[PDB]
């Protein structure tokens, strides 16, 4: 069975508590990721 | 910034050589005394700087949530810049910024 739990050890989705979040860079959308026109 | 015993490892205090009229500087739990080279016994301020440059690493480049720049770094060349305000946090401080090279590594400033 391939459910959450496989993306969650296959390093595409992670958790992060509110300390961690003190060093990331959130983007809101998918689309933030690139600069548009 | 004062010193610590030679011999017994604890802190000198200063004193005065009343037969010589020159500042040594006594242990109160041996007998040991040295000469000094500096004059100076007391320092006292209220214009400070301290946490000026002090906020900078060897890795601050890898800090991936400063913003970068576009300044030319003038002994690099580089234009690609991460920025950031001075780092004391009084009132009163200035607002400047301070500019780290990502190549060259030499903070630098707008001025
Ligand atoms: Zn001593
Ligand atoms: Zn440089």
Not at chain 1, 1 to 29: H, K, Q, R
Not at chain 2, 44 to 72: M, Y
Request: proline content about 4%.
């Amino acid at each position: 069975v391939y459910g959450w739990s496989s993306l969650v050890t296959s390093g595409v989705i992670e958790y992060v508590d509110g300390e961690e979040e003190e060093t990331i860079m959130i983007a809101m959308t998918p689309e933030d990721l690139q600069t548009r026109s | 910034s004062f010193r610590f015993c030679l011999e017994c490892n604890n802190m000198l205090y200063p004193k005065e050589d009343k037969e010589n009229q020159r500042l040594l500087y006594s242990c109160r739990n041996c007998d040991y005394t040295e000469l000094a080279e500096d004059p100076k016994v007391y320092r006292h301020e209220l214009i400070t700087n301290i946490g000026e440059t002090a906020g900078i690493v060897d890795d601050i480049g890898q800090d991936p949530t400063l913003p970068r720049s576009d300044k030319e770094c003038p002994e690099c060349h580089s234009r690609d810049c991460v920025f950031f305000q001075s780092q004391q946090r009084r009132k009163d401080t200035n607002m400047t910024l301070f500019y780290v090279c990502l190549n060259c590594k030499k903070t630098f400033r707008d001025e």
